[PDB]
Coordinates of C-alpha atoms and ligand atoms in Angstrom, one line a residue:
Chain N
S1 CA 98.7 132.1 -34.9
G2 CA 96.6 129.8 -36.8
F3 CA 98.3 127.3 -39.7
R4 CA 97.1 127.2 -43.3
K5 CA 97.9 125.6 -46.3
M6 CA 99.0 128.5 -48.2
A7 CA 99.7 129.3 -51.4
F8 CA 102.6 132.0 -53.3
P9 CA 100.7 135.0 -54.0
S10 CA 100.0 134.6 -58.1
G11 CA 99.4 138.1 -59.9
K12 CA 103.2 137.3 -61.3
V13 CA 102.6 134.3 -62.5
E14 CA 98.7 135.4 -64.0
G15 CA 100.1 137.8 -66.4
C16 CA 101.7 135.1 -68.4
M17 CA 99.2 132.9 -69.0
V18 CA 97.9 132.6 -72.5
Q19 CA 95.6 130.3 -74.8
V20 CA 96.7 128.2 -76.9
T21 CA 95.1 126.7 -79.9
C22 CA 96.1 123.9 -82.5
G23 CA 93.1 122.8 -84.8
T24 CA 90.5 121.9 -82.4
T25 CA 92.7 121.7 -79.2
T26 CA 92.8 124.5 -76.8
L27 CA 95.2 124.2 -73.6
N28 CA 97.1 127.1 -71.6
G29 CA 100.7 128.4 -72.0
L30 CA 102.7 130.2 -70.3
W31 CA 104.2 133.5 -72.2
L32 CA 107.7 134.4 -71.0
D33 CA 109.7 137.0 -73.4
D34 CA 108.6 136.4 -76.9
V35 CA 108.4 132.4 -76.2
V36 CA 105.2 130.6 -75.7
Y37 CA 105.6 126.9 -73.5
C38 CA 102.7 124.6 -73.8
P39 CA 102.0 121.2 -73.7
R40 CA 102.9 119.3 -77.2
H41 CA 100.2 117.2 -77.2
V42 CA 98.2 120.2 -78.4
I43 CA 99.0 118.8 -81.9
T45 CA 94.2 114.5 -82.6
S46 CA 92.3 111.8 -80.7
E47 CA 93.0 109.0 -82.8
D48 CA 96.7 110.4 -82.6
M49 CA 96.2 109.8 -78.4
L50 CA 96.6 106.7 -78.4
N51 CA 100.3 106.0 -79.7
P52 CA 101.5 109.8 -81.5
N53 CA 104.7 110.0 -83.5
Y54 CA 105.0 113.7 -81.9
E55 CA 108.3 114.8 -84.4
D56 CA 105.9 113.4 -87.4
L57 CA 102.2 115.0 -86.2
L58 CA 104.8 118.4 -85.7
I59 CA 106.2 118.2 -89.2
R60 CA 102.4 118.9 -91.0
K61 CA 102.3 122.0 -88.8
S62 CA 103.3 125.6 -90.0
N63 CA 103.6 128.6 -87.6
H64 CA 100.1 130.3 -88.9
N65 CA 98.4 126.6 -87.0
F66 CA 99.0 128.1 -84.0
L67 CA 96.4 130.5 -82.2
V68 CA 98.3 132.0 -79.5
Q69 CA 95.8 134.2 -77.4
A70 CA 96.8 136.7 -74.7
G71 CA 93.3 137.6 -73.1
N72 CA 91.9 139.5 -76.3
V73 CA 95.5 140.6 -78.1
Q74 CA 96.2 138.1 -81.0
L75 CA 99.5 136.8 -81.0
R76 CA 101.7 136.1 -84.4
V77 CA 103.8 133.1 -84.4
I78 CA 106.9 133.3 -85.9
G79 CA 108.6 130.4 -85.2
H80 CA 107.8 126.8 -83.1
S81 CA 110.2 124.1 -81.8
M82 CA 109.7 120.7 -79.7
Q83 CA 112.0 120.8 -76.5
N84 CA 111.1 117.0 -75.1
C85 CA 107.4 117.0 -74.5
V86 CA 107.2 120.6 -74.4
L87 CA 106.0 122.9 -77.1
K88 CA 107.5 126.3 -77.3
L89 CA 106.3 129.0 -79.6
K90 CA 108.5 132.0 -81.0
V91 CA 106.4 135.0 -81.3
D92 CA 106.7 138.3 -82.5
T93 CA 106.1 140.5 -79.0
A94 CA 107.8 139.9 -75.5
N95 CA 105.6 139.9 -73.0
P96 CA 105.5 143.1 -71.1
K97 CA 104.7 141.3 -67.6
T98 CA 107.2 138.8 -67.8
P99 CA 108.6 138.5 -64.2
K100 CA 112.3 137.5 -63.1
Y101 CA 112.1 134.0 -63.3
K102 CA 113.6 130.6 -63.7
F103 CA 113.1 126.8 -64.9
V104 CA 114.0 124.7 -61.9
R105 CA 113.4 121.2 -61.5
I106 CA 112.0 119.8 -58.0
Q107 CA 113.0 116.8 -55.9
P108 CA 110.2 114.8 -54.4
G109 CA 108.6 116.1 -51.5
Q110 CA 109.5 119.7 -52.2
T111 CA 105.4 121.7 -52.4
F112 CA 104.5 124.2 -55.1
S113 CA 101.5 126.4 -55.7
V114 CA 99.5 125.3 -58.7
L115 CA 97.8 128.0 -60.8
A116 CA 95.0 126.1 -62.2
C117 CA 93.6 127.8 -66.0
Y118 CA 91.1 127.1 -68.5
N119 CA 91.4 128.8 -72.3
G120 CA 94.3 131.0 -70.6
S121 CA 92.2 132.0 -67.6
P122 CA 93.0 131.9 -64.1
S123 CA 90.4 129.7 -62.1
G124 CA 92.2 129.3 -58.7
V125 CA 95.5 128.5 -56.7
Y126 CA 96.4 125.8 -54.5
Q127 CA 99.3 124.5 -52.8
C128 CA 100.7 121.0 -53.1
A129 CA 103.6 118.7 -53.2
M130 CA 105.2 116.4 -55.7
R131 CA 105.1 112.5 -54.4
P132 CA 107.6 110.2 -54.1
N133 CA 106.5 108.4 -56.7
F134 CA 106.1 111.9 -58.7
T135 CA 102.4 112.4 -59.2
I136 CA 100.7 115.2 -57.6
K137 CA 97.4 115.1 -56.4
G138 CA 95.7 117.9 -57.8
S139 CA 92.4 119.9 -59.0
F140 CA 92.6 119.4 -62.7
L141 CA 89.5 119.1 -65.1
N142 CA 90.0 118.4 -69.3
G143 CA 91.2 121.8 -70.4
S144 CA 93.6 122.9 -67.5
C145 CA 96.5 121.5 -69.0
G146 CA 99.5 124.0 -69.6
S147 CA 98.7 125.1 -65.7
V148 CA 102.1 125.5 -64.4
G149 CA 103.1 125.2 -60.7
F150 CA 106.0 127.8 -59.0
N151 CA 107.8 128.6 -56.7
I152 CA 108.4 132.1 -55.5
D153 CA 111.5 133.1 -53.8
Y154 CA 111.2 137.1 -53.5
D155 CA 110.5 138.7 -56.8
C156 CA 111.9 135.6 -58.3
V157 CA 109.3 133.3 -59.9
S158 CA 110.6 129.6 -60.0
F159 CA 108.6 127.0 -62.4
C160 CA 108.8 123.9 -61.9
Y161 CA 105.7 122.1 -63.1
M162 CA 103.5 121.9 -66.2
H163 CA 100.2 119.9 -66.3
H164 CA 100.0 117.7 -68.9
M165 CA 98.2 114.6 -68.1
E166 CA 95.3 112.9 -65.7
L167 CA 95.9 109.2 -64.8
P168 CA 92.8 106.6 -64.4
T169 CA 94.1 106.9 -60.8
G170 CA 92.9 110.1 -60.6
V171 CA 96.1 112.1 -59.7
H172 CA 98.0 113.9 -62.1
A173 CA 101.5 114.3 -63.9
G174 CA 103.7 116.8 -65.7
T175 CA 106.9 117.8 -67.2
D176 CA 109.3 120.6 -65.6
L177 CA 109.8 123.7 -68.0
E178 CA 112.2 121.8 -70.0
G179 CA 109.2 119.1 -71.1
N180 CA 111.2 116.1 -68.9
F181 CA 108.2 114.2 -67.2
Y182 CA 108.5 113.7 -63.3
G183 CA 108.3 110.5 -63.3
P184 CA 108.1 107.3 -65.9
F185 CA 105.0 108.8 -67.7
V186 CA 104.6 109.7 -71.5
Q189 CA 97.2 107.8 -73.8
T190 CA 97.7 104.0 -72.3
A191 CA 97.7 102.1 -68.8
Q192 CA 100.9 103.8 -67.0
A193 CA 101.3 102.8 -63.5
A194 CA 102.3 105.0 -61.0
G195 CA 104.9 103.6 -58.4
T196 CA 103.6 103.2 -54.6
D197 CA 103.5 106.2 -53.0
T198 CA 105.3 106.9 -49.7
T199 CA 105.0 109.6 -47.2
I200 CA 107.2 112.6 -47.3
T201 CA 109.0 111.9 -43.5
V202 CA 110.5 115.3 -42.8
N203 CA 107.2 117.0 -44.0
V204 CA 105.6 115.4 -41.3
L205 CA 108.0 115.8 -38.9
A206 CA 108.2 119.7 -39.9
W207 CA 104.7 119.7 -39.9
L208 CA 104.9 118.5 -35.7
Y209 CA 106.8 121.2 -35.4
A210 CA 104.9 123.8 -36.5
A211 CA 101.8 122.2 -34.2
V212 CA 104.0 122.8 -31.2
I213 CA 104.8 125.9 -32.4
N214 CA 100.9 126.9 -32.4
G215 CA 100.3 125.2 -28.7
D216 CA 99.7 122.0 -30.1
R217 CA 101.5 119.4 -28.1
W218 CA 99.8 116.0 -27.0
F219 CA 101.7 114.3 -29.0
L220 CA 105.0 115.0 -27.1
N221 CA 106.4 112.0 -25.3
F223 CA 110.6 109.1 -25.6
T224 CA 113.8 109.3 -27.3
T225 CA 115.0 107.0 -30.5
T226 CA 118.1 106.6 -33.0
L227 CA 117.7 107.5 -36.7
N228 CA 118.1 104.1 -37.4
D229 CA 115.6 102.8 -35.3
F230 CA 113.2 105.3 -36.3
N231 CA 114.1 104.2 -39.9
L232 CA 113.0 100.8 -39.1
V233 CA 109.7 101.5 -38.0
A234 CA 109.2 104.4 -40.9
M235 CA 110.0 101.8 -43.6
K236 CA 107.3 99.7 -42.4
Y237 CA 104.5 102.4 -42.6
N238 CA 105.3 103.4 -46.3
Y239 CA 107.7 106.7 -44.7
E240 CA 110.4 108.1 -46.5
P241 CA 113.6 107.1 -45.3
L242 CA 115.0 110.7 -42.8
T243 CA 118.5 111.1 -43.7
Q244 CA 121.3 113.2 -41.8
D245 CA 120.4 115.8 -44.4
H246 CA 116.9 115.7 -43.4
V247 CA 117.8 116.4 -39.7
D248 CA 119.8 119.1 -40.4
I249 CA 117.0 120.9 -42.7
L250 CA 115.1 120.5 -39.6
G251 CA 117.8 122.3 -37.1
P252 CA 116.0 125.9 -37.4
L253 CA 112.5 124.3 -36.1
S254 CA 114.6 122.1 -33.8
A255 CA 116.2 125.1 -31.9
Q256 CA 113.1 127.5 -32.3
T257 CA 111.0 124.9 -30.2
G258 CA 113.5 123.6 -28.3
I259 CA 112.8 119.9 -29.5
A260 CA 115.3 117.5 -30.6
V261 CA 115.0 116.2 -33.8
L262 CA 115.1 112.3 -32.7
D263 CA 112.9 113.3 -29.9
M264 CA 110.1 114.6 -32.5
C265 CA 111.4 111.5 -34.1
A266 CA 109.9 109.3 -31.1
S267 CA 106.9 111.1 -30.8
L268 CA 106.1 110.5 -34.5
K269 CA 107.1 106.6 -34.2
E270 CA 104.7 106.4 -31.8
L271 CA 101.9 108.3 -33.5
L272 CA 102.6 105.8 -36.1
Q273 CA 102.6 103.2 -34.2
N274 CA 99.5 103.9 -32.2
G275 CA 97.6 106.1 -34.5
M276 CA 95.7 109.3 -33.1
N277 CA 93.0 107.7 -31.3
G278 CA 90.3 109.8 -32.2
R279 CA 92.8 113.1 -31.5
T280 CA 93.7 116.0 -34.3
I281 CA 96.5 117.9 -34.8
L282 CA 96.0 121.5 -36.3
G283 CA 92.5 120.5 -37.4
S284 CA 93.8 117.1 -39.0
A285 CA 93.0 113.6 -38.4
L286 CA 96.0 113.0 -40.5
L287 CA 99.7 113.2 -40.6
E288 CA 100.3 115.4 -43.3
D289 CA 103.3 115.5 -45.3
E290 CA 102.5 118.5 -47.6
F291 CA 104.6 121.4 -46.1
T292 CA 108.4 121.5 -46.3
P293 CA 110.5 122.6 -43.5
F294 CA 111.0 125.8 -45.2
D295 CA 106.9 126.3 -45.4
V296 CA 106.5 126.0 -41.9
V297 CA 109.8 128.5 -41.4
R298 CA 108.0 131.1 -43.9
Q299 CA 104.5 130.7 -42.6
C300 CA 105.5 131.3 -39.0
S301 CA 107.9 133.9 -39.4
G302 CA 105.8 135.3 -42.5
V303 CA 107.9 135.9 -45.4
Chain U
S1 CA 89.7 114.9 -61.5
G2 CA 90.7 115.8 -57.4
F3 CA 89.4 118.2 -55.4
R4 CA 91.4 121.0 -53.4
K5 CA 90.4 124.2 -51.2
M6 CA 91.3 126.5 -53.8
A7 CA 91.8 130.2 -53.7
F8 CA 90.6 132.5 -56.2
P9 CA 93.7 134.1 -58.2
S10 CA 95.1 137.1 -56.1
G11 CA 96.8 139.7 -58.7
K12 CA 94.2 142.0 -58.6
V13 CA 94.3 142.3 -54.8
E14 CA 98.1 142.8 -54.9
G15 CA 98.2 145.8 -56.7
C16 CA 96.0 147.3 -53.8
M17 CA 97.7 146.1 -51.0
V18 CA 99.9 149.3 -49.5
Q19 CA 101.7 150.0 -46.1
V20 CA 100.3 151.8 -43.6
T21 CA 102.2 153.7 -40.6
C22 CA 101.2 155.8 -37.7
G23 CA 103.7 157.0 -34.9
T24 CA 105.6 153.3 -34.7
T25 CA 102.5 151.5 -35.5
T26 CA 102.6 149.8 -39.0
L27 CA 100.4 147.9 -40.7
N28 CA 98.5 146.9 -44.1
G29 CA 95.8 149.3 -45.9
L30 CA 93.8 148.6 -49.3
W31 CA 94.6 151.1 -51.8
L32 CA 91.1 151.9 -53.9
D33 CA 90.6 154.3 -55.8
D34 CA 91.8 158.1 -53.8
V35 CA 91.4 156.3 -50.6
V36 CA 93.3 153.7 -48.3
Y37 CA 91.4 151.7 -45.7
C38 CA 93.4 150.5 -43.1
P39 CA 92.3 149.1 -39.8
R40 CA 91.5 152.3 -37.5
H41 CA 93.8 151.0 -34.7
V42 CA 96.6 151.8 -36.3
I43 CA 96.5 155.2 -34.5
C44 CA 96.5 153.1 -31.1
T45 CA 100.0 153.0 -28.6
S46 CA 100.0 150.0 -26.8
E47 CA 98.8 152.1 -23.5
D48 CA 95.9 152.6 -25.8
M49 CA 94.6 149.1 -26.8
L50 CA 93.5 148.1 -23.3
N51 CA 90.9 150.9 -23.0
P52 CA 90.8 153.4 -26.5
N53 CA 88.6 156.2 -27.2
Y54 CA 89.4 156.3 -30.6
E55 CA 87.7 159.7 -31.6
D56 CA 89.7 161.6 -29.2
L57 CA 93.0 159.4 -30.5
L58 CA 91.9 160.0 -34.0
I59 CA 91.4 164.1 -33.1
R60 CA 94.5 164.6 -32.0
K61 CA 96.3 163.0 -35.3
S62 CA 96.5 165.0 -38.7
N63 CA 96.9 163.8 -42.0
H64 CA 101.2 164.2 -41.9
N65 CA 100.9 161.8 -39.2
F66 CA 100.2 159.0 -41.6
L67 CA 102.9 157.1 -43.6
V68 CA 101.4 155.6 -46.7
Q69 CA 104.0 153.3 -48.5
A70 CA 102.8 152.1 -52.1
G71 CA 106.0 150.0 -53.2
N72 CA 108.8 152.3 -52.9
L75 CA 101.7 158.3 -51.4
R76 CA 100.6 161.9 -49.5
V77 CA 97.2 161.9 -47.4
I78 CA 95.4 164.9 -48.1
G79 CA 92.5 163.5 -45.6
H80 CA 91.1 161.2 -43.4
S81 CA 88.3 160.0 -41.9
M82 CA 86.4 157.2 -39.4
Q83 CA 83.8 155.0 -40.5
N84 CA 83.0 152.5 -37.6
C85 CA 86.5 150.6 -37.0
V86 CA 88.1 151.2 -40.6
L87 CA 90.1 154.4 -41.6
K88 CA 90.0 156.0 -44.5
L89 CA 92.9 158.2 -46.0
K90 CA 92.1 160.0 -49.3
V91 CA 95.5 160.1 -51.1
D92 CA 96.5 162.3 -54.1
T93 CA 96.6 159.9 -56.7
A94 CA 94.1 157.2 -57.4
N95 CA 95.4 153.4 -57.6
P96 CA 96.0 152.8 -61.5
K97 CA 95.4 149.2 -60.8
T98 CA 92.4 149.6 -58.7
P99 CA 90.1 146.8 -60.1
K100 CA 86.4 146.7 -60.6
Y101 CA 85.0 146.4 -57.3
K102 CA 82.2 146.0 -54.7
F103 CA 82.1 146.5 -50.8
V104 CA 79.7 143.6 -49.5
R105 CA 79.0 141.6 -46.1
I106 CA 79.0 138.1 -45.9
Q107 CA 76.9 135.3 -44.0
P108 CA 78.1 132.8 -41.9
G109 CA 78.7 129.9 -43.7
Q110 CA 80.6 131.4 -47.0
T111 CA 83.7 131.3 -48.0
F112 CA 86.3 134.1 -49.4
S113 CA 90.2 134.0 -50.0
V114 CA 92.7 136.1 -48.0
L115 CA 95.8 137.4 -49.1
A116 CA 98.0 137.4 -46.2
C117 CA 100.0 140.2 -46.2
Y118 CA 102.8 141.8 -44.0
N119 CA 104.3 145.2 -44.0
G120 CA 102.6 145.9 -47.2
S121 CA 103.8 142.6 -49.4
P122 CA 101.9 139.7 -50.0
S123 CA 103.0 136.5 -48.5
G124 CA 100.3 133.8 -49.5
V125 CA 97.0 133.3 -50.1
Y126 CA 94.4 130.6 -49.1
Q127 CA 90.4 130.1 -48.8
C128 CA 88.3 129.9 -45.3
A129 CA 85.4 130.6 -44.4
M130 CA 83.2 132.5 -41.7
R131 CA 82.2 130.9 -39.2
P132 CA 78.5 130.9 -37.7
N133 CA 80.1 132.7 -34.6
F134 CA 81.4 134.9 -36.5
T135 CA 85.6 133.7 -36.1
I136 CA 88.0 132.8 -39.0
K137 CA 90.4 130.1 -38.5
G138 CA 93.4 131.8 -40.8
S139 CA 96.8 132.0 -40.2
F140 CA 97.6 135.7 -39.3
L141 CA 100.6 136.7 -37.3
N142 CA 101.4 140.5 -35.8
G143 CA 101.8 142.3 -38.5
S144 CA 98.9 141.1 -40.5
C145 CA 96.2 143.2 -39.9
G146 CA 95.1 145.3 -43.2
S147 CA 94.4 142.0 -45.1
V148 CA 91.4 141.5 -46.8
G149 CA 89.5 138.7 -47.8
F150 CA 87.6 138.3 -50.7
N151 CA 85.7 136.6 -53.8
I152 CA 86.0 137.4 -57.4
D153 CA 82.7 137.0 -59.6
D155 CA 86.6 140.3 -63.5
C156 CA 85.0 142.1 -60.3
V157 CA 86.5 141.5 -56.4
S158 CA 84.5 141.6 -53.9
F159 CA 86.0 142.5 -50.9
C160 CA 84.0 141.0 -47.7
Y161 CA 86.9 141.1 -44.8
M162 CA 89.6 142.8 -43.4
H163 CA 91.6 141.6 -40.6
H164 CA 91.5 143.1 -37.1
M165 CA 92.6 140.7 -34.5
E166 CA 94.0 137.6 -32.9
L167 CA 92.2 135.9 -30.3
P168 CA 93.5 134.0 -27.5
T169 CA 91.9 131.3 -28.6
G170 CA 94.0 131.1 -31.8
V171 CA 91.1 132.5 -34.0
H172 CA 90.6 135.6 -36.2
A173 CA 88.4 138.5 -36.1
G174 CA 87.7 141.5 -38.6
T175 CA 85.1 144.0 -40.1
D176 CA 83.9 144.6 -43.4
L177 CA 84.8 147.2 -45.7
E178 CA 82.7 149.5 -44.0
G179 CA 84.1 149.2 -40.6
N180 CA 81.7 146.6 -39.0
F181 CA 82.6 143.7 -36.9
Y182 CA 81.5 140.4 -37.4
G183 CA 80.5 139.2 -34.6
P184 CA 80.3 140.4 -31.2
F185 CA 83.8 141.8 -31.3
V186 CA 85.5 145.5 -30.6
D187 CA 88.7 146.6 -31.7
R188 CA 89.8 146.4 -27.9
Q189 CA 92.8 144.6 -25.9
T190 CA 90.0 143.0 -23.5
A191 CA 89.0 139.2 -23.3
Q192 CA 86.4 138.9 -25.4
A193 CA 84.8 135.4 -26.1
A194 CA 83.2 134.2 -29.1
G195 CA 80.0 132.0 -29.6
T196 CA 79.7 128.5 -29.5
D197 CA 80.7 127.5 -32.9
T198 CA 78.6 125.1 -35.0
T199 CA 79.3 123.0 -38.3
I200 CA 78.4 124.5 -41.0
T201 CA 75.5 121.6 -42.4
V202 CA 75.0 122.9 -46.2
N203 CA 78.9 123.0 -46.9
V204 CA 79.3 119.4 -45.7
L205 CA 76.8 118.4 -47.4
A206 CA 77.9 120.0 -50.5
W207 CA 81.2 118.5 -50.1
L208 CA 79.8 115.4 -50.0
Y209 CA 78.4 115.8 -53.6
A210 CA 81.9 116.9 -54.8
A211 CA 83.1 113.5 -52.9
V212 CA 80.3 111.4 -55.0
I213 CA 81.6 113.9 -58.2
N214 CA 84.9 112.9 -57.7
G215 CA 84.0 109.0 -57.3
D216 CA 84.1 108.5 -53.4
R217 CA 80.8 107.2 -52.8
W218 CA 81.0 104.4 -50.2
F219 CA 78.8 106.6 -47.6
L220 CA 75.9 106.6 -49.6
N221 CA 73.0 104.9 -48.1
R222 CA 69.4 103.6 -49.9
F223 CA 67.6 105.6 -46.4
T224 CA 65.5 108.3 -46.8
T225 CA 64.5 112.0 -44.6
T226 CA 62.6 115.1 -43.8
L227 CA 64.0 117.8 -42.6
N228 CA 62.7 117.9 -39.7
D229 CA 64.2 114.2 -38.7
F230 CA 67.4 115.3 -39.9
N231 CA 67.8 118.6 -37.7
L232 CA 67.1 116.5 -35.1
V233 CA 70.4 114.1 -35.6
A234 CA 72.1 117.7 -36.7
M235 CA 71.3 119.5 -33.4
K236 CA 72.7 116.8 -31.1
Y237 CA 76.5 117.3 -33.0
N238 CA 76.3 120.6 -33.0
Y239 CA 75.7 121.2 -36.7
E240 CA 73.6 123.8 -38.0
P241 CA 70.1 123.4 -39.1
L242 CA 69.2 122.7 -42.2
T243 CA 66.4 125.0 -44.2
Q244 CA 64.4 124.9 -47.2
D245 CA 66.2 127.4 -48.8
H246 CA 69.6 125.4 -47.7
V247 CA 68.3 122.4 -49.9
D248 CA 67.1 124.9 -52.8
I249 CA 71.3 126.0 -52.8
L250 CA 71.9 121.8 -53.2
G251 CA 69.6 121.7 -56.0
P252 CA 72.3 121.9 -59.2
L253 CA 74.4 119.6 -57.4
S254 CA 71.5 117.2 -56.6
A255 CA 70.4 117.3 -60.7
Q256 CA 74.0 116.5 -62.0
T257 CA 74.9 113.5 -59.1
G258 CA 71.4 111.9 -59.5
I259 CA 71.1 111.9 -55.9
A260 CA 68.8 113.4 -54.2
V261 CA 68.7 116.3 -51.4
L262 CA 67.5 114.2 -48.5
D263 CA 68.9 111.4 -49.9
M264 CA 72.6 113.2 -49.2
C265 CA 71.0 114.0 -45.6
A266 CA 69.9 110.7 -44.5
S267 CA 73.8 109.3 -45.9
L268 CA 75.0 112.5 -43.4
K269 CA 73.2 110.9 -40.5
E270 CA 75.2 107.9 -40.8
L271 CA 78.2 109.6 -40.3
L272 CA 77.4 111.8 -37.6
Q273 CA 75.7 108.6 -35.9
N274 CA 78.8 106.1 -37.0
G275 CA 81.6 108.1 -37.5
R279 CA 87.8 105.5 -43.9
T280 CA 88.6 108.6 -45.9
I281 CA 86.4 111.1 -47.8
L282 CA 88.5 112.6 -50.6
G283 CA 91.5 112.2 -48.7
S284 CA 90.1 113.9 -45.1
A285 CA 89.2 112.1 -42.4
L286 CA 86.7 114.4 -40.9
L287 CA 84.0 115.9 -42.9
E288 CA 84.7 119.5 -44.1
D289 CA 82.4 122.4 -44.0
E290 CA 84.3 124.9 -46.0
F291 CA 83.2 124.3 -49.1
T292 CA 80.0 126.4 -50.4
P293 CA 77.5 124.6 -53.1
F294 CA 78.8 127.5 -55.7
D295 CA 82.7 126.9 -54.3
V296 CA 81.9 123.0 -55.5
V297 CA 79.8 124.0 -58.6
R298 CA 82.7 126.3 -59.9
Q299 CA 85.8 124.0 -58.9
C300 CA 84.4 121.2 -60.9
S301 CA 82.7 123.0 -64.3
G302 CA 85.8 124.6 -64.3
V303 CA 84.6 128.9 -63.5
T304 CA 88.0 131.0 -64.9
Ligands
TKX1 C1 94.9 118.2 -70.6 O1 95.0 119.1 -69.8 C2 93.8 118.8 -71.9 N1 93.2 119.4 -72.1 C3 92.4 119.8 -73.2 C4 92.4 118.7 -74.3 BR1 91.5 119.4 -75.6 C5 93.0 117.8 -74.3 C6 93.5 117.4 -72.6 O2 94.6 116.7 -72.6 C7 93.9 115.2 -72.7 C8 95.0 114.4 -72.5 C9 94.9 113.4 -71.5 C10 95.9 112.5 -71.0 C11 97.4 111.9 -72.1 CL1 98.3 110.8 -71.4 C12 97.1 113.2 -73.0 N2 98.7 112.8 -73.4 O3 98.3 112.0 -74.4 O4 99.3 114.0 -73.5 C13 96.4 114.1 -73.5
TKX2 C1 97.3 143.3 -36.0 O1 97.3 143.0 -37.2 C2 98.6 144.2 -35.6 N1 100.1 144.5 -36.6 C3 100.4 145.3 -36.3 C4 100.6 146.1 -34.9 BR1 101.9 147.0 -34.3 C5 99.4 146.1 -34.6 C6 98.3 144.8 -34.9 O2 97.1 144.7 -34.1 C7 97.5 143.9 -32.6 C8 95.9 144.1 -32.2 C9 95.6 143.2 -31.6 C10 94.7 142.8 -30.7 C11 93.9 143.8 -30.9 CL1 92.1 143.6 -30.1 C12 93.8 145.2 -31.3 N2 92.8 145.7 -31.3 O3 92.7 146.6 -30.2 O4 92.2 146.2 -32.2 C13 95.2 144.9 -31.8

C-alpha cells in the first residue's frame, strides 16, 4: 500500500564519488575503473564569461589536478577532454566500481540523483528529465559532478552529470560522455517551454486506481481527440508506443488506456475541484510506467 | 537552487539488510554486530496472526528454525525484546556502521530503505505523523525495513511491522516498542485523528522564501496564542515556544520573524497559487531538514 516518489538505493554510486580540485575550484567527480569523470569547467570566474576550454586545458598539467577519494589521494597520470566532461586517468582502479553503463535517456524518463559536495554524499532523490531537457533538482554551489543514475538489477546506468544552475532556478547537465541535454553550453540561456509528460501522468493515474483512489474515473475517447485536448493544455502528444508501454498497467487494472485518457481529458478541462489524488492536488508527471510497475510489484 | 524531499544516502544501511526466514514466513532483518533484528511476527503462521501468544510461539521454536540470509549465517541464539526478535549469529557484520537506536518524536523525519527478501528496493523520506503512523510505500514482504537518520553514525529509529487497512503503516523502534497504540496482531486497530505538523509547515515556508517564493508573505503580526486559535480549527498541531525557538536559525537567515511567518500561515489556512511547486502545505520537512538541504550538509 501507499505510493511514494522513490529513489534507487544509492550505495553503489556512493562508492564512486570523489573530490576533484583544480586551482581553487573544487567539485565532485565519478571514479570508475582508473578514470575520474567530472565537469570540465573545474578548470576561473573570469573564464566563466567566455572560456576557450581547449586553450585553458592546454595550460594545465597532471599535477594541477587533486583527486581525493575520502582520505586517500589519487595521483593523476593523464587528462583528456571529451565534449564537456574531463576524464582524469588515475594510477588506481576503484575497487568499488560496480557493473555500470553510460546511457543517454530520453525526455520524460526518471532517474535518481545523489547530490554531493566535496566528494561526500548529502542526499538522494528521484526526478525526471523534463521535455525541455532541464531537471528541477536541488543543487547548491559545489554540487556539480553529482550524477543521476538508474539501477537495472546490479547494473548502474549513469545518465546525468550536473553542470549548471540556470537563472530560472532549474538545472542542466550532460550525459557521461559530455553531451549536454538540450541546447545548453555563464550567459543568458533560455530553456524551451516546458510541457507535461502525458504518459507519466496516465501511469500515475493507474497507480492511484491500484491504491484505491478512483473518484476521477468516468466516457471514452480516441487517441486523436485526446491529443487535441493535450495540445491545448501543454501536454506532450500521446503516441501508440506510449499506449503499448501502458499495456501491463491496463491489464492489471482492467481499465483501457483510452478510457483512462478520457478521465484525464476531463481532469484537464474541469480541474480537480479541490480533490486530491494520492495526496497531491496537482497532476504528477515524474513517474514512468516502469516506475509504477516497479513500486507496485516491489522489484 | 530547488527544494526536494531528500532521503539520506543509504549505503550504510544496505550493508545491514538480510533476509530472515522462519517456516514459510520470510521478511527483512537488520544485521549489526552479531545480532539480527527482525519483527517478531516472523514466527507466526496465518492462523496465529489473529491472536498470537508470542511467548508460547517462540518457546516452540529453536535456533535452527531460523534461516538468516546475507546475500548468498548460523543462528546461535534467539531472544524476544518487546516486539522485535534478536537473533544472535556466529558472525559479526563486517559492514556494521557506527550506529545508535533512537526513539523519535512525532513530527520528526527519517529515510526509509524499503526492502524485500533482504534486498533494497528504494529509499524515500517520510515523517512520523502525530498519530504515530507513517504514510509510506510498503507492500507485503517489506516488514523488517528500517527508517533512519544519519548524523558517519546511523541513527536507526523505525522498523516496519504492519500495513493498516487505512493504507498507512505502523512499526516499532529498534527496541521493539510500537509507535502509537498498535500491537502486532491482525485485528481492526484505529489510529488517532491525524493533525498537521505546524512547525514543519513553517519550516517549509522558510525554504520557499529562501528559494524565491515569497508571495504568501504579509505585514501582519500575531501572538503564539492567537495563531493557535486559528490552527486548532484547521486541525493543525499547536505551536509552542519550543517550536518558535527551533525556527530561530531560519528566522535569522531570512530576516522574517517567526510570528510574522505564523501570520502569513494564518492567511494560507483562512484563505487557501503554488508554493515550491506544491498546491498543498507540506508538513514533512523539519526545520533541521530545511537547513540541511539549503546549507548542503553532507
Ligand atoms: C557547480 O556545481 C559549481 N560548484 C562549485 C564551483 Br567553485 C563552481 C561550480 O560551477 C559554477 C557554474 C555555474 C554555471 C555555469 Cl553555466 C557554469 N559553467 O560555466 O559551466 C559553472
Ligand atoms: C509484512 O511486512 C509481512 N511480510 C511478509 C509476510 Br509472509 C508477513 C508480513 O506481515 C503481515 C502482517 C500484517 C499485519 C499485521 Cl498486524 C501483522 N502482525 O500480526 O504483526 C503481520
